[model samples]
Every structure is written in C-alpha cells, then in structure tokens.
Target: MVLSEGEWQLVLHVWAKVEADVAGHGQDIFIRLFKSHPETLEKFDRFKHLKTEAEMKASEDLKKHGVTVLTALGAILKKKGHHEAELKPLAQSHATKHKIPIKYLEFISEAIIHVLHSRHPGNFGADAQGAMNKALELFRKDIAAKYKELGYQG
Candidate 1:
C-alpha cells in the first residue's frame, strides 16, 4: 500500500532484469557489499573464510548464500511488498541462532539496489529506486523488530 501500482510495477520490472541472471547478479551484489564493508566479511559463514575478491568470486558457498538472500528479496516483490512482515520469524531465528546483525540484512538490500541501478543507468529510474527502497524499508523495520523483541539491542 505504500507504493502506487505503477511504482511497484516499475520496481518489479527492473528487478526481473537482474533476477533473470540470479547467480551472477547475486555474486556481484555480495562482492559490492563486501567491498564497501570488508569487516562484515567476518560476520558471515560463507564469506568468513574468503580472503580476496577473486576467492570470493570463485566461492560456491558465496554463490549459494548470495542467491538465497537475493531470492528471499524477490519473495517480497512477489507479494507486492506486503510480505515483509512475514520475514519476522526468519529474522528472529537468525538474530537469536545465527547471531547476524540486522544491519547485514539491510546491507544486502542496499547491494541489490546498487546492482540494479548501476546495471541500468537509464532504465532504473528515480521512480524505481524510490519504490524499491520503500519496499525494502518496510521490511527493515519488520525484521529489526524481532531482534529488539528478544533483548538484543544494538
């Protein structure tokens, strides 16, 4: 409900472009994310042992995890952005069991948008950016709610 039909439509249309080549796009997103914040590498299971860009680029673990996370995002678009609240239980388990920071989840959102925007300079327009960003933002609060609920303050 946050976005008009066309705005979310625009976001989904742009997402399909990247989603078609999920593996490479997913890898590129993680690469861009880790490049921006190398410290975060130590926080992840698949990425913890990766030392260099080339090594990460070649990692099956990275590819698998990258695809999993990106595909999870696609689920939100599939629901027309209302499925964000549905991510709470998964976030809860991750927060309590996996001990991953909520920020890391948010970082993936950034990387996805970065890939979409950088990949299509003209096609991924401002409307798409705003729409996609708003879509992710709803889930940012949705996912973060669980961490806070469990006495995990940060």
Candidate 2:
C-alpha cells in the first residue's frame, strides 16, 4: 500500500538480510517468539520443520503461494486509510490457514522487533524500525497477492 521512503528502505534491507542470512534472522525471530510463547510452536511446526534443501524448495513454493494469496488483503490495505485495518485480514488469513491467533501474530511482531533491536542494532535504529514497519506492510501485501494468485474472492 502506502509506504514512507524510509520504511521502503527498511524492507529491502531486511529482505537482503533474510537472503544473506538464509532465514537465519527469521529463525532467530522464530526461536525467541516460540520460546517465550510455546503455544505458537504448535501452529508453526510444519513451517519450522522444513529445513532440508528439498523441503526448502518445496516450502519456497508454499511461501510463494502465500505471497500470491496476500494480494486480496493488499488491496484492502491500499484502500484503507488506517494501517491497522490491514492487520485484521492478515490475522484472519493466518488464523484460518495456520490457526495462529492474533496474539501470536502480535508476538511475532514484538519478537522480531526485539531481535532486530538486539541483533541488528544498526538496522534496528529509527530508520530501520521504519523500514521494518514497511517490511511488515509489504508482507501483508504479499500475503494478499498470494491469495489473489490462489484464486479466491470471498
């Protein structure tokens, strides 16, 4: 949807880090979040177990699909004035598909912020935080796109 220049910069930076780290930063976020809130593990188990190269290849397909599906919600984000509205559909989508609660969704955000704050300190600065926020927005957009790609309108 709408993103500030700084926020957009953050998205690319984090994306680059994810690629360079091979989801290392992602796993770090996952570990901290799940460790603090063990229940999230149940919902994430399937996604987490995908580590083998073959599994990664296959899982990448699923992630790609997720990006496609997210487009429907992305459209909502573009139209909605307030950013918070965007999170509702994303939470709904995850709850419907992965059974993750809004609480868990929140946990994911906070935990990543925590890790980003501690681990990637430089990138976690105000500019980086803005970028992370942008990344989150882009992530919602990607999720909606995935939904559109999967063919659904209800």
Candidate 3:
C-alpha cells in the first residue's frame, strides 16, 4: 500500500500526540491488547498473572514494556526504506526469546489502530487508518522474515 505524502503526514501527526502521552496511551494499548486477546498475556511473564487493570498499571515492568514498544514503533515510523534492517534484531529476539508469533505482531497493529481511533475520534478516519494498516503490514512483513528463518511456521 502506497501512502501519499499527505497520508504519511497524517500518521506522524497522530503519532506525535500518542507519543506525548505514553503513560496513558501506552498503557491503554497493552490493556486493550490483553483485554481483546487474553491468551497473549501468556507471552508477557510480567503481566500474565495480573488479574486487574490496577495491578497492570502499578507494575513498572509492564509500563516499561509499553514504553519500549511504543518507542520502537515510533522509530520504525520515522525511518524509510530500511524497516527490515531496523526491525531485524527485534524480530529475531521476539520470535526466539519472547516466542511471540507473527499473528501477535499483526494484532499489535490492530490494537494500535483501535487505540488511535478511540483516542482521536475526529481525526483518525479512513485515510489515517489506511496509512496505519499499511505501516503495520510493512512492519509485520519485515518481522516475519525472521520468524520464518527461526523455523516458526506460525
């Protein structure tokens, strides 16, 4: 999917706002991820046992994890034509160590779209959502390259 210059600008515009409130929006991202797919919690040892939102919010590890994810995505968004290179190390580590499947990586994009739409109801419409989908697709494709090399069929 090719994003027009305008579309790219739209994505960055919203991302700047999301980046500004990582504590709130970042937590919301993970909260929605676990809420939408409880099974995913198993991959996060720090969060798997948290039975409630309060517990999740209070956990420094969870918050740090959220920030790390958002920060990485922010970096990925900032770069052009080298996403595969930028994402390779993470793809290897996540697949080998975290054992996070490609599907879960795909779900992260979905969660991001949901959170962006919910957070910016008036601004995040079809164009913005489409750009995000394309961005995530690129990220997933790059990450999946390592997944295949790691012998993960999923």
22-93: candidate 1 lDDT, tens digit per residue: 999989999998988787787777568787899988999889988887787788677875674657767767
Best by TM-score: 3
Misplaced by over 4 Å in model 2 are 44-93, 134-154
TM-score of 1: 0.88
- Which digits, one per residue and each the tens of the lDDT, describe model 3 over residues 42-67? 88776789998788778888888888
Give the per-residue lDDT of model 2 (tens digit) for 16-134. Answer: 55455444554555556656776665665556554444554445544554444334333443443344455566645664666544345556667767876787676667877876665
Model with the higher lDDT, candidate 1 or 2: 1
| Full-model lDDT, candidate 3 | 0.81
Candidate 3: give its CA RMSD in angstroms: 1.6
TM for every model, in the order presented, reads 0.88, 0.53, 0.91
Model 3 off-target regions past 4 Å? none
Ranking by lDDT: 3, 1, 2
Native-vs-model 2 lDDT? Answer: 0.55
Clashes of 3: 0
Q: Where is the poorest 10-residue window by lDDT in model 2?
A: 72-81
Candidate 1 Cα misplacement greater than 4 A, ranges: none
